[PDB]
Design a protein around this motif. Structure first.
Motif, PDB file in Angstrom:
ATOM      1  N   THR A  89       0.805  -1.215   0.000  1.00  0.00           N
ATOM      2  CA  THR A  89       0.000   0.000   0.000  1.00  0.00           C
ATOM      3  C   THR A  89       0.842   1.269   0.000  1.00  0.00           C
ATOM      4  O   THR A  89       0.355   2.317  -0.438  1.00  0.00           O
ATOM      5  N   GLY A  90       2.084   1.205   0.472  1.00  0.00           N
ATOM      6  CA  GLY A  90       2.905   2.391   0.596  1.00  0.00           C
ATOM      7  C   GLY A  90       2.583   3.266   1.787  1.00  0.00           C
ATOM      8  O   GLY A  90       3.202   4.326   1.939  1.00  0.00           O
ATOM      9  N   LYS A  91       1.642   2.859   2.631  1.00  0.00           N
ATOM     10  CA  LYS A  91       1.266   3.659   3.785  1.00  0.00           C
ATOM     11  C   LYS A  91       2.447   3.786   4.745  1.00  0.00           C
ATOM     12  O   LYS A  91       3.142   2.797   5.007  1.00  0.00           O
ATOM     13  N   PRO A  92       2.713   4.980   5.272  1.00  0.00           N
ATOM     14  CA  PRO A  92       3.776   5.124   6.274  1.00  0.00           C
ATOM     15  C   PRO A  92       3.436   4.347   7.534  1.00  0.00           C
ATOM     16  O   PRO A  92       2.275   4.251   7.941  1.00  0.00           O
ATOM     17  N   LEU A  93       4.469   3.785   8.155  1.00  0.00           N
ATOM     18  CA  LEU A  93       4.302   2.841   9.251  1.00  0.00           C
ATOM     19  C   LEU A  93       4.908   3.398  10.529  1.00  0.00           C
ATOM     20  O   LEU A  93       6.048   3.876  10.526  1.00  0.00           O
ATOM     21  N   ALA A  94       4.146   3.326  11.614  1.00  0.00           N
ATOM     22  CA  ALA A  94       4.617   3.666  12.946  1.00  0.00           C
ATOM     23  C   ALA A  94       4.913   2.396  13.735  1.00  0.00           C
ATOM     24  O   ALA A  94       4.416   1.312  13.423  1.00  0.00           O
ATOM     25  N   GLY A  95       5.735   2.545  14.770  1.00  0.00           N
ATOM     26  CA  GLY A  95       6.095   1.431  15.620  1.00  0.00           C
ATOM     27  C   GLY A  95       7.361   0.700  15.232  1.00  0.00           C
ATOM     28  O   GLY A  95       7.764  -0.227  15.947  1.00  0.00           O
ATOM     29  N   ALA A  96       8.000   1.077  14.129  1.00  0.00           N
ATOM     30  CA  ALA A  96       9.265   0.470  13.742  1.00  0.00           C
ATOM     31  C   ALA A  96      10.404   1.106  14.528  1.00  0.00           C
ATOM     32  O   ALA A  96      10.480   2.333  14.648  1.00  0.00           O
ATOM     33  N   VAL A  97      11.287   0.271  15.067  1.00  0.00           N
ATOM     34  CA  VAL A  97      12.408   0.723  15.882  1.00  0.00           C
ATOM     35  C   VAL A  97      13.685   0.597  15.064  1.00  0.00           C
ATOM     36  O   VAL A  97      13.966  -0.466  14.498  1.00  0.00           O
ATOM     37  N   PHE A  98      14.452   1.682  15.001  1.00  0.00           N
ATOM     38  CA  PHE A  98      15.724   1.711  14.298  1.00  0.00           C
ATOM     39  C   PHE A  98      16.839   2.128  15.246  1.00  0.00           C
ATOM     40  O   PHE A  98      16.606   2.735  16.294  1.00  0.00           O
ATOM     41  N   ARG A  99      18.064   1.794  14.854  1.00  0.00           N
ATOM     42  CA  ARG A  99      19.263   2.236  15.547  1.00  0.00           C
ATOM     43  C   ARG A  99      20.362   2.441  14.517  1.00  0.00           C
ATOM     44  O   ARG A  99      20.528   1.623  13.607  1.00  0.00           O
ATOM     45  N   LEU A 100      21.098   3.539  14.654  1.00  0.00           N
ATOM     46  CA  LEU A 100      22.164   3.895  13.727  1.00  0.00           C
ATOM     47  C   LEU A 100      23.509   3.611  14.382  1.00  0.00           C
ATOM     48  O   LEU A 100      23.814   4.163  15.445  1.00  0.00           O
ATOM     49  N   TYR A 101      24.304   2.751  13.753  1.00  0.00           N
ATOM     50  CA  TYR A 101      25.644   2.430  14.224  1.00  0.00           C
ATOM     51  C   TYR A 101      26.675   3.192  13.402  1.00  0.00           C
ATOM     52  O   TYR A 101      26.547   3.310  12.180  1.00  0.00           O
ATOM     53  N   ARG A 102      27.695   3.710  14.081  1.00  0.00           N
ATOM     54  CA  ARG A 102      28.755   4.486  13.453  1.00  0.00           C
ATOM     55  C   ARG A 102      30.084   3.782  13.680  1.00  0.00           C
ATOM     56  O   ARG A 102      30.429   3.452  14.820  1.00  0.00           O
ATOM     57  N   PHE A 103      30.822   3.550  12.596  1.00  0.00           N
ATOM     58  CA  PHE A 103      32.108   2.868  12.643  1.00  0.00           C
ATOM     59  C   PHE A 103      33.187   3.770  12.060  1.00  0.00           C
ATOM     60  O   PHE A 103      32.989   4.373  11.000  1.00  0.00           O
ATOM     61  N   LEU A 104      34.325   3.853  12.745  1.00  0.00           N
ATOM     62  CA  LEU A 104      35.492   4.578  12.255  1.00  0.00           C
ATOM     63  C   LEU A 104      36.571   3.572  11.884  1.00  0.00           C
ATOM     64  O   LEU A 104      36.993   2.770  12.726  1.00  0.00           O
ATOM     65  N   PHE A 105      37.013   3.616  10.631  1.00  0.00           N
ATOM     66  CA  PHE A 105      38.021   2.700  10.121  1.00  0.00           C
ATOM     67  C   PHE A 105      39.239   3.473   9.638  1.00  0.00           C
ATOM     68  O   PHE A 105      39.111   4.556   9.060  1.00  0.00           O
ATOM     69  N   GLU A 106      40.418   2.901   9.867  1.00  0.00           N
ATOM     70  CA  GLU A 106      41.635   3.337   9.196  1.00  0.00           C
ATOM     71  C   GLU A 106      41.770   2.535   7.908  1.00  0.00           C
ATOM     72  O   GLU A 106      41.885   1.307   7.949  1.00  0.00           O
ATOM     73  N   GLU A 107      41.749   3.223   6.771  1.00  0.00           N
ATOM     74  CA  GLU A 107      41.785   2.576   5.467  1.00  0.00           C
ATOM     75  C   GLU A 107      43.158   2.751   4.834  1.00  0.00           C
ATOM     76  O   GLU A 107      43.688   3.866   4.777  1.00  0.00           O
ATOM     77  N   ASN A 108      43.730   1.639   4.365  1.00  0.00           N
ATOM     78  CA  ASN A 108      45.009   1.603   3.655  1.00  0.00           C
ATOM     79  C   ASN A 108      46.156   2.215   4.455  1.00  0.00           C
ATOM     80  O   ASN A 108      47.200   2.549   3.885  1.00  0.00           O
ATOM     81  N   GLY A 109      45.995   2.358   5.768  1.00  0.00           N
ATOM     82  CA  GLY A 109      47.017   3.007   6.571  1.00  0.00           C
ATOM     83  C   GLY A 109      47.259   4.451   6.197  1.00  0.00           C
ATOM     84  O   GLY A 109      48.360   4.967   6.417  1.00  0.00           O
ATOM     85  N   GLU A 110      46.257   5.116   5.621  1.00  0.00           N
ATOM     86  CA  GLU A 110      46.386   6.506   5.194  1.00  0.00           C
ATOM     87  C   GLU A 110      45.174   7.371   5.512  1.00  0.00           C
ATOM     88  O   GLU A 110      45.349   8.573   5.738  1.00  0.00           O
ATOM     89  N   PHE A 111      43.961   6.824   5.537  1.00  0.00           N
ATOM     90  CA  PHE A 111      42.750   7.607   5.715  1.00  0.00           C
ATOM     91  C   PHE A 111      41.965   7.104   6.918  1.00  0.00           C
ATOM     92  O   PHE A 111      42.195   6.002   7.423  1.00  0.00           O
TER      93      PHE A 111
END
Lengths: 149, 149, 149, 149, 149, 149
Positions: free
Chosen positions: E53-75
Motif C-alpha cells: 500500500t505504501g502507507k507510512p508505518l509507525a512502531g518500527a524501531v531503528f538504531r544507527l551504528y557508526r564505525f570509524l576505520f583506518e583505510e590503507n594506513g592513510e585515511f
C-alpha cells in the motif's frame, strides 16, 4: 608529571603504550605512611620522613600512576610510578616529582607475582631510600626541611 | 605542553585516560580575541591584552587541547586546556604554556551543561584574569611586554 | 621526553592521538652511526659527531618514538621523533632531548612514500645538521665536548 | 557469540564501545554450579539443571564476557553477558548462546553497588529462570535433554 | 547486529577498527519518518512504508551504528549502518537487521563533504528502495505485512 | 563474519580485545592459490580446490582478519582468521565463513616464531584439509560444486 612518570616507567626494548591510569591523591598522616594497593592486591608501603631528624611527616600529597605497556610485541608490562604532588608545609617544594618505580613481573613458567621497587635518579628535595628492591619492608622517603634565617 | 596540559586537566580521584585531542593553532588578531568552540557547541571567549596598557594583542598563537577521562570508574569527564604556543612579538616569551582549564560537568539528574573555567597557577609571562568561573563574560589574558634598554 | 617528542610530532591543524610507540635504546658504535628502520622499511641514517673535530662518537644512547595521529578527521599521520637518551661520556649532558622529526606523508593520488626530516629547535648540547629534508644522505648530529680545567 | 553478547549488553541511548573482555571457559561440576566473580568482587551464582527433572548438570561450558560502554557521553556502563559455550553431553546443543545479562549500576549520589540480572529472550535449548533481578539467590538455568528413539 | 553492521561497513582494502558507536533507538511515528543526524550535521531521511500500500508505518524501531576505520594506513573512513531493531506490529519480523550503509567520503583536494547511501543485499522482510546514492531525497524502506488466515 | 572470526580466534583463558585488523579481499586465480603475508613476514599458502576433482578454482574471494588479544593479563596473542567471502561461481555458496585459524606463538625463552594452523569446525560447503598444524606445506581448501538438474 604524567610523562615524566611515563619516561621512568618505559622499560628497555620495543614497546607500546596501552593504558594510563592514576589513583586518588593521598595525604600522609602523622605516621607519614602511604599505603598503595596495586591491581594485584599487594600493598606497597612508603613513609615520608625528615631527611635529618627522621620524624614522620604529615601533609605530603602523593599520587600513584599506573602504565600498561606492550613489551617486545609479546608481553604486557604493568609499571607503577609514585609521584609526590606536594611536599609537607615548611619543607622544600617537591611538586609533581616522580620518586619510585614499581615493576610487576609475573614469572612465565607458572610462577607467582614478583614486585621490584626502583628509585628515580633525579636530584630533588625528596628521594627514596636505598634498599634491595622488594616489597618486604617499608621504603622511606626523605624530605629536606626549609631552614629559616 | 601536552602532558603539562594533561596534568592540569587531571581531576581529583581515581581516573583513566581515554582520548587526547587538540584543535588548530589559532592566531589572535588586532581585537586580541580567541574564540574556542567546545564539542558541545558553546563558545568560550578569551582576550590577549597587555598587562599594563590593556591594549589587545595580535600575533599570539594558542592551541586548545581536549582530554577525555574516566573518573571514579563511573563518569566520563571532558577537560579542556588552553595553551599559549607563542607570545606576541615584542612580548616576553610564552612557549607551550597552559593558561586556562575548562571542565564540562553535566548535571546527572537531567540537567543542562555547566562549564567552569579555572586558571593554571604557574608563574609565567602570561596569565588568566581573576573572575568567577563561568562562561558569562570574556576572560582576559595578560602578557608582559619586554622592555628594551 | 615522551611528551616533548609528542609536542614536536604534533602537526598543524585538528588532530587526535592514536598510538604511542618506541624502539629499543640503541648505542652508537665507533662509526657514530644510528640506523633506524621505519615501519615502511626505509632506513634513516644519523651520525653522532663532535661539533668541533667531527670525529664520530660512541657511547651515545638514542631512542626512536613513533606517534600515530588522526589529522583533520581525514588522514592518519605517522610522525617519528628521534631522542638522545644519553650523551657520550666526556661530552656535555644531553638527557632525553628530542633531536629530529620524521614525517611520513604518502601521496594521496596513488603516489609512493615520501619522508621529510626536520630538526628540533631547542637549545641543547646536541643538534641536528642543516640539510634539505630528505632521506638521501646521512644526517649528522653534533655534540659539544665538556672542556676540563 | 561475542557480538550477540554485545547486542544484549548494549543499553538504550547513545553509546560507545570501550572494552571487550572475557573470562576463562568454566565447566560445571556435579553440583551444576557456576560462580562468576565480577570486577567489583561480588559473586553471581548460576546453576545448570535439567528442565524436567531439575537434576544439576555437569559438563556444561560457560564463558563470561565483560563490556565497558560510554553511555550518553556521561557515564561508563559495565555490562556482563553469560554465554553457554557447550551444553552437557546428552542434552540438546547450546553452542555460544547468551543466557543472562548483568548490569552494574552504581548510584551517583554516593551509593553502593547495585546489580541487576536479566535474561536473554532467544528461543534456545537453554534458558535462565524467572526471578526478581537481584543477586540474592542462585539463578537456575534449564537445559532440555535429547530424547533417544 | 553490531558485527553484521560492521561487515557491511568494512570497505575494500586494508583496514583497522578504531571506534564503534551507536545512536539511541528511534521509533517511527505516523509519518514513518526517521531522521538521523550524522556527526557532520547532515540529516539523512528514511521512511518506513508498506511494501504494497505504501502507507507510512509507525512502531518500527531503528538504531544507527557508526564505525570509524583506518583505510590503507592513510585515511580515516566513517561508515554508518542503519539497523531495524523491530518491525512494526502486524508486519513480518525484522529483528536487528541492517538496511542501509552510509559512507562519508571527504574530497582530499580541499573539497566539501560527500555522502553515499547503499543498501544491504540481505533477503529480509524489510528492504531499502532503489535510487541514486545521494542524500537529495528521502529513501523509502518497505515492510512486508503478515497476512492472517 | 568479523565476530565469528573473533570467536574462533579467542583462545582459552582470561582475555581482552586490543585490535581488529583485516587485509584486502583477494581473488584466487587459475592456480587456486592464496598467499597471505602475516605481520611477521611469513607466507601462509592456501589452495582452493574442487572437493571431488581437486581442480584448482578461480573466482573465490578471501579476506584475512587479524586479532590482537591480551591473554591472562601477561601476553599479547596474535590470532589470524581466514574467511571465504565468496565461493567460486558454479559452486555452493560460502559467504563470509571462517575457514582457518593461525596462531603466532613466540617462544618466551628467546625462541623463534612458531605458527600453528587450525581449521574451523563449522559445517559449510568449504572446508580446510587435514594436516599437522605447521606452515611447511600448502593447505588445501575444498569446495563443493553445485550440481545442475
Amino acid at each position: 608529571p604524567v610523562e615524566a612518570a611515563k619516561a621512568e616507567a618505559i622499560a628497555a626494548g620495543k614497546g607500546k603504550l596501552l593504558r594510563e591510569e592514576w589513583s586518588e591523591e593521598k595525604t600522609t598522616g602523622e605516621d607519614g605512611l602511604l599505603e598503595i594497593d596495586l591491581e594485584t592486591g599487594k600493598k606497597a608501603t612508603f613513609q615520608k620522613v625528615d631527611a635529618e631528624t627522621g620524624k614522620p611527616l604529615a601533609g605530603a600529597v602523593f599520587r600513584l600512576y599506573r602504565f600498561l605497556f606492550e613489551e617486545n610485541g609479546e608481553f604486557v608490562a604493568e609499571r607503577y610510578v609514585l609521584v609526590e604532588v606536594r611536599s609537607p608545609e615548611g619543607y622544600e617544594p617537591v611538586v609533581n616529582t616522580p620518586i619510585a618505580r614499581i615493576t610487576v613481573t609475573k614469572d612465565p613458567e607458572t610462577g607467582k607475582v614478583t614486585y621490584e621497587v626502583e628509585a628515580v635518579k633525579n636530584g630533588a628535595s625528596a628521594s627514596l631510600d636505598e634498599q634491595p628492591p622488594s616489597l618486604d619492608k617499608t621504603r622511606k622517603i626523605y624530605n629536606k626541611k626549609a631552614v629559616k634565617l
